[PDB]
Write a protein that binds this ligand. Structure first.
Ligand code: MET
Length: 520
């Protein structure tokens, strides 16, 4: 039952540079990973690059560079981007890696031996930009790169082309009943629920067999050869999906480089994924194809697929530019708070500033300053509380209930709802402080201040602990200001109210230090 918590992002295409969609997907992956480490579990978080296929090769042809140099360069830009964004991903995987290819061949061979791969033809539409097979119902009319009539995808609006090849075929049609059993037996396996319902409808309709090879010429020879048939290459998505299996089997050193590939996945206790984070654009591949391959191979199926609301891939939005302007943690807070499982979000500077000023500065920041202020907290310590009033007890109840509420939300996972829950408590704590007016209590009633101050400090600690996956740097600052011992900054034991004992001294002040500075 207890294993390493395995969380993954999709592996991104290297045809263009890093951008918001990749940053978001990896941010979600990172936060889930961070939450489970704070909870005290073992974690392996995976991200990477999808480097083979027609469109990557063509993207490299256009830049007058060999596919090897082009992919190695762009992968480097992705790695730099993720270091810059301050993630805590455990490993970065590239499909060009030899161990990955080893695993692909191994999986391919398994599927072939079970009788689930046969030689056939695909005659039909294809989107090179989505590397996706389409039926005629998923295309319509549109405009070429030059401007002529042509066909485009209803899915993405990218150009389609007709394909008539002799291909290796995966017997996907044979897995319809089993996939439907899987979805019905595990009704939390796809999130959010309306995307779960979408998948089920699709599979109910019926499943065609799936092309899993292309002729080597079509792919510009930039792909993995099919075992025992050099004229064919492995489909970029069988290749790409398999990264999760590869990553589950790689021992990794202290610096982050891969070292060794185990034979049996159970050695490392990662497979299958506990959470696959993906965009909505790639749901069919993760919820239909991937499990069908795993069923064919007799491999365990993933627990959860979370499909967020942005399609994974004169109006620029540069994450690193904005994080340099508003702060890293602040931008992360905004991206995770502004949207759930929909595109709609006012990603404007007006709204980024509204939430920076309203929530992060006025609600969280102001509250940290009030409970550490030398005017209010005169001894610079956690006081021992006196007797609790019924109003005190109501706030204490909220703080006690928060961990279990936030835990359920983080496990769904619905990170927006987990933030909202924490901030509801932060608002309540502010309301309580304005009622008790502890600044007045310093002169008039000191025994009472002890109680008010203790509750405020402990509320700030518990909320900050649950926000630490969202605001990893600022949570450390906050804990330093509160003087929270290092041991108390993680572990489910410290989700409990009263974990930091009275008499703990605060961290020292800096002359005019601000936590979140208000902009405009
Ligand atoms: C197995 S995840 C693959 C995702 C795909 N390379 C994309 O960027 O959309």
């Amino acid at each position: 039952v207890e294993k390493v918590f395995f969380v993954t992002s999709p592996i991104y295409y290297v045809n263009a540079a890093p951008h918001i969609g990749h940053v978001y997907s990896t941010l979600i992956t990172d936060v889930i990973g961070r939450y489970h480490r704070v909870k005290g579990e073992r974690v392996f978080a995976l991200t990477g690059t999808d480097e083979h296929g027609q469109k990557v090769a063509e993207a490299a042809k256009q830049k007058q560079v060999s596919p090897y140099d082009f992919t190695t360069a762009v992968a480097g830009e992705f790695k730099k981007c993720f270091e810059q964004m301050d993630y805590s991903i455990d490993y970065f995987i590239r499909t060009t890696n030899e161990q990955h290819k080893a695993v692909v061949k191994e999986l391919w061979t398994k599927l072939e031996q079970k009788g689930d791969i046969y030689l056939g033809r695909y005659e039909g539409w294809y989107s090179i930009s989505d590397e996706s097979f389409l039926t005629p119902q998923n295309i319509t009319d549109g405009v070429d790169k030059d401007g002529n009539p042509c066909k485009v995808s209803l899915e993405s609006g990218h150009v389609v082309t007709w394909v008539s090849e002799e291909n290796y075929m995966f017997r996907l049609s044979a897995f319809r009943e089993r996939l439907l059993e899987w979805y019905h037996a595990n009704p939390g396996c796809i999130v959010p629920e309306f995307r779960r319902r979408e998948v089920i409808r699709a599979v109910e309709k019926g499943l065609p067999d799936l092309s899993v090879s292309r002729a080597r010429a079509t792919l510009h020879n930039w792909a993995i050869p099919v075992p025992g048939n050099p004229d064919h290459c492995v489909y970029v998505w069988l290749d790409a999906l398999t990264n999760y299996l590869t990553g589950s089997r790689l021992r990794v050193d202290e610096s982050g480089k891969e070292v060794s590939l185990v034979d049996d996945f159970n050695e490392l206790e990662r497979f299958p994924a506990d959470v696959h984070v993906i965009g909505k654009d790639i749901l069919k591949f993760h919820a239909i194809y991937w499990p069908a391959f795993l069923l064919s191979a007799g491999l365990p199926l993933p627990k959860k697929i979370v499909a967020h609301g942005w399609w994974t891939k004169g109006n620029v939005f540069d994450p690193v530019e904005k994080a340099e302007e508003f702060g890293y943690d602040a931008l992360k807070y905004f991206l995770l708070r502004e949207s759930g499982f929909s595109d709609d979000g006012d990603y404007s500077d007006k709204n980024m500033i509204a939430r920076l000023n309203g929530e992060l500065a006025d609600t969280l920041g102001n509250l940290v300053m009030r409970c550490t202020s030398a005017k209010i907290n005169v001894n610079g310590e956690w006081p021992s509380p006196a007797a609790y009033t019924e109003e005190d007890e109501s706030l204490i109840q909220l703080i006690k209930d928060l961990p279990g509420t936030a835990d359920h939300y983080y496990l769904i996972p619905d990170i927006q709802k987990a933030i909202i829950a924490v901030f509801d408590v932060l608002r309540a704590i502010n309301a309580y402080v304005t009622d008790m007016a502890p600044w007045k209590l310093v002169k008039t009633d000191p025994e009472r201040l002890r109680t008010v101050l203790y509750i405020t400090l402990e509320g700030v600690r518990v909320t900050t602990l649950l926000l630490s996956p969202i605001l990893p740097r600022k949570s450390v600052v906050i804990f330093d200001m509160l003087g929270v011992p290092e041991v108390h900054r993680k572990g489910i034991e410290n989700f409990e109210f009263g974990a930091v004992p009275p008499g703990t001294r605060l961290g020292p002040a800096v002359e005019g230090e601000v936590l979140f500075s208000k902009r405009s």
